[PDB]
């Protein structure tokens, strides 16, 4: 009787959920220790770091255990309820918007702090910066209220009455769904993508023409060598952002762009396995934003093993 149950076998399922659980534990412990560390002068970048860390901690701890509890093992008869599903996708879309806007404004603060630094001394202040943190949180909530305006419950049994056939799906029509998730992918992926990539290439270009041309001794090429390690910590953040938040948004828009005429059974199976892959990559990003901020800089490595042990 339970139709619309996909036959996903248990070996790949337990491999994916083991990847998920390892990702979750290392990501929540990393975001916990970096949030407590930044909770432990021009300190206008620590707020962006802590805000992105809190956004990653929030998306992990709110989506991921509920995600394994009612998305990979327990299929279409769910157990979280109407307010549960609507608030769950509200928090998911809000955390995605918050992580995207955190990448935007962190890259903007870096660009003002290097390529126009006197305008950062004039413009950027700790008070304003806290105002911008509250502003991007309120922008995430205001852009996630259409996720409250688009979600719902829908029975898709043989007569639409069975309590083992109701799913929690976008209940709006295909066109308005297209529009909301297309502006979702457009803003919350592409404008972060071009903004973070353009400003990080300009910052890396300014650093490379500051250490190569040098307008003096480079200091036996030691501090500028770790400045090229800073080029690595720039480029690694931007490539991690694009390579993690690209396929999730491609999967959202391939859910929008197909209207059952291009779906087959194998493409249904491939869509569900690709959904496990893209949410694996989202939890990858949620784990390796604090891991990228921790491991590649040895001072963070020492102080966080001092926090751990």
């Amino acid at each position: 009787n339970s139709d619309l149950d996909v036959n996903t076998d248990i070996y790949s399922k337990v491999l994916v959920t083991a990847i998920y659980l390892a990702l979750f534990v290392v990501g929540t412990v990393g975001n916990s220790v970096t949030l407590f560390t930044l909770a432990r002068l021009q300190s206008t970048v620590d707020y962006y770091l802590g805000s992105l860390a809190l956004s990653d901690l929030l998306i992990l701890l709110l989506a991921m255990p509920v995600e394994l509890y009612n998305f990979i093992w327990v299929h279409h008869p769910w157990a979280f309820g109407d307010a549960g599903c609507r608030g769950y996708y509200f928090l998911r879309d809000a955390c995605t918007y918050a992580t995207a806007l955190n990448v935007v404004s962190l890259s903007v603060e870096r660009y003002l702090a290097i390529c126009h630094p006197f305008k950062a001394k004039t413009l950027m202040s700790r008070s304003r910066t806290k105002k911008f943190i509250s502003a991007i949180w309120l922008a995430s909530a205001l852009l996630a209220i259409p996720m409250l305006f688009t979600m719902g419950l829908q029975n898709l049994s043989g007569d639409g009455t069975h309590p083992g056939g109701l799913v929690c799906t976008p209940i709006v029509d295909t066109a308005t769904l297209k529009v909301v998730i297309q502006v979702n992918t457009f803003m919350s992926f592409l404008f972060p993508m071009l903004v973070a990539s353009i400003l990080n290439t300009v910052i890396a270009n300014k650093l490379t023409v500051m250490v190569h041309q040098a307008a003096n001794m480079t200091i036996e090429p030691g501090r500028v060598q770790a400045l090229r390690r800073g080029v690595l910590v720039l480029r690694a953040v931007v490539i991690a952002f694009v390579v993690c938040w690209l396929p999730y948004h491609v999967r959202r828009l391939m859910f929008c762009y197909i209207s059952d005429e291009q779906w087959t059974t194998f493409l249904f199976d491939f869509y569900h396995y690709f959904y496990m892959l893209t949410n694996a990559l989202v939890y990858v990003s949620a784990a390796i934003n604090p891991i990228l901020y921790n491991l590649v800089s040895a001072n963070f490595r020492q102080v966080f093993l001092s926090t751990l042990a």
């Binding site: 829908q154 898709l156 976008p170 959202r252 059952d260 779906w263």
Partner: peptide
Amino acid sequence: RRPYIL
């Protein structure tokens, strides 16, 4: 046969 999970 359209997927429902987003």
